[PDB]
Amino acid sequence: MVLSEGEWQLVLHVWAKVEADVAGHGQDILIRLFKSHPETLEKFDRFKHLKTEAEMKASEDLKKHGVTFLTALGAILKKKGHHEAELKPLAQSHATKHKIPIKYLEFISEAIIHVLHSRHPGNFGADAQGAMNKALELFRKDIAAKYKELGYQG
Ligand code: HEM
C-alpha cells in the first residue's frame, strides 16, 4: 500500500502534537491496551504483576518503556513508508524474543487510535484517522511479511 503525501501530512501533523508529551502518550497507550486486552499484559514479564490501572500509572518502568515504544514508532512513521531498515530489528525481537502475534499488533493499533482520538479531537477528525489507520495497516502488513521471512507465524 502507498499513502499519498496528503495522508502522510495528516499523520505527521497529529504526531507533532503527540511529541509534545511522549511519556504521557506512551503510558496512555500501553495502559489502554492492557485494559482492553488483558491477555497482552502476559507477554511482558516485567509488568505482568501489575493488578490495577492505578498500579500501572504509578509504574516508572512502564512509563520508561512507553517512551521507548513510542519513540521507535515515531521513527518509523517519519520515514513515510521507507522504513525497511527500522523494521528489521523490530520484527526480529518481537517475532523471536517476545513472540507477539499480529493480532496483538492490531490491538495496539486500536489503542493508539483511541488515545489520539481522546487527546487530539481537533487534529484527528475522520480523514486524519483514516490516514493514521492506513499508516498502521502499512506497518502491520510490512511487519507480517518480515515475520514470515523470519520463520514466525506467518
Ligand atoms: C507499534 C508497535 C510496537 C513497537 C514500535 C514496539 C517497540 C518496542 C521497542 C522499541 C522495544 C525495545 C527493544 C526490542 O525489544 O525490540 C520493545 C520491547 C518489547 N515489546 Fe514492543 N513494540 C510494539 C508492539 C508490541 C506489542 C503489541 C507487544 C505485546 C502485546 C510488545 C511487547 C514487547 C515486549 C514484551 C518487549 C520487552 C519489554 C521489556 O523490555 O521487558 N510490543 N517493543
86 Cβ contact partners less than 8 Å away, ≥ 6 residues apart: 72, 75, 76, 79
Please calculate the CA angle 46-84-76 and round it to the nearest 5 degrees: 55
Buried b (16+ CB within 10 A) or exposed e, 115-152: bbeebbeeebeeebeebbbbbbebbeebbbebbeeeeb
The backbone torsions φ and ψ at residue 125, rounded to the nearest 5 degrees and listed phi first, read: -75, -175
Q: Tell me the C-alpha distance between 72 and 86, whole Å.
A: 8
Gap from CA of 94 to ligand 1 centroid (Å): 6
Please give the C-alpha separations between residue 130 and each of 10, 26, 83, 98, 133, in angstroms, as whole numbers: 9, 21, 20, 29, 5
Could you say which architecture CATH assigns to the domain 1-154?
Answer: Orthogonal Bundle (1.10)
Long-range contacts made by residues 2-6, C-beta under 8 angstroms, separation at least 24?
Answer: 2/81, 3/80, 3/81, 3/131, 3/134, 3/135, 3/138, 6/131
Domain limits, the chain: 1-154
Q: Using a 6 Å cutoff on CB, does residue 153 contact ligand 1?
A: no
Q: Using a 6 Å cutoff on CB, does residue 143 contact ligand 1?
A: no
Please name which of 6, 5, 8 lies closest in space to residue 139, comparing C-alpha atoms: 8
The resolution in angstroms reads: 2.0
Q: Using a 6 Å cutoff on CB, does residue 47 contact ligand 1?
A: no
Mutation probe of ligand 1 site: the residue of 22, 29, 69 with most atoms within 8 A of C-beta: 69
Secondary structure in 3-state letters for 51-103: CCHHHHHCCHHHHHHHHHHHHHHHHHHCCCCCCHHHHHHHHHHHHHHHCCCHH
Residue with CA nearest ligand 1 atom 23: 69
Q: Tell me the C-alpha distance between 34 and 107, whole Å.
A: 10
Q: Using a 6 Å cutoff on CB, does residue 100 contact ligand 1?
A: yes
In the structure grid, which three cell numbers stand for residue 101, read together?
A: 502475534
Give the type of residue at 95.
A
